[PDB]
Carbonic anhydrase 2
Amino acid sequence: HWGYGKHNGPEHWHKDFPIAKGERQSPVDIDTHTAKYDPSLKPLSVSYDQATSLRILNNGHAFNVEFDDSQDKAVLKGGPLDGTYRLIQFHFHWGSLDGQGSEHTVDKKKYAAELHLVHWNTKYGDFGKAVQQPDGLAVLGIFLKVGSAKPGLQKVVDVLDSIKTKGKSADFTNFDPRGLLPESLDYWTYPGSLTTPPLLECVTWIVLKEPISVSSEQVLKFRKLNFNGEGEPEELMVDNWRPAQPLKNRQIKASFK
Ligand SMILES: NS(=O)(=O)c1c(F)c(F)c(SCCc2ccccc2)c(F)c1NCc1ccccc1
Ligand SMILES: [Zn+2]
């Protein structure tokens, strides 16, 4: 029932998911002048050499590239995190137009899209248990702007026609998520939530400062996906982002400068 459309979009979510109006909701506007450099933060450690991608799924809201997380193979640690977070899936949010699409904003600036690499804290044993904990997830957020193509994204763009509609999936092995990272790992971090229902307040957000560039042709292919299932009227999958939510009693910390 929840979605992005005219009648079931983010402004409606609170009726099924009252935590929508909670104290640590995401995304947020990153006010770069008020984020405080925190010299006690660590460099982030992104270890994806052993990543095992399995499958790509259109779930009717976005597409997820799913990983094998039954062993320590693709982990995020360091930075603001204690302990070890496994990679479980990544997905994107994007706009109908290049001027919008990202969920976090930077001094109110919207990017064309935003990548979310989702990881769960191994101390809780699995994803379903982790999301019930305030430190259960670490999401690495990366902005996309339109300019030169991102070679490491092409294998993703090229399988999308095979998962056009809701519920379709395709084998997606041997995908290396290192090809989606920018050069710098400088980041902002704050405590937040999943940006989709159930909107659980279980996420340490780590949002990279440096955006990656993707081509206009790459993002156009994202916008040919469908929210609807096969043999339903076409509703293009665009504008699947939640707008910035109030920061409330939170501090965003910078790893740099
Ligand atoms: N967008 S996000 O990075 O904050 C995110 C996340 F961190 C997750 F762990 C997950 S999986 C957690 C979902 C869940 C469902 C039922 C019960 C418990 C938990 C996300 F789906 C998304 N959302 C993905 C998405 C994007 C666009 C449309 C629909 C879903
Ligand atoms: Zn997301």
Remarks:
- The pocket of zinc ion (ligand 2) is lined by residues 91, 93, 116, 195 (CB under 6 Å).
- The longest helix spans residues 216-222.
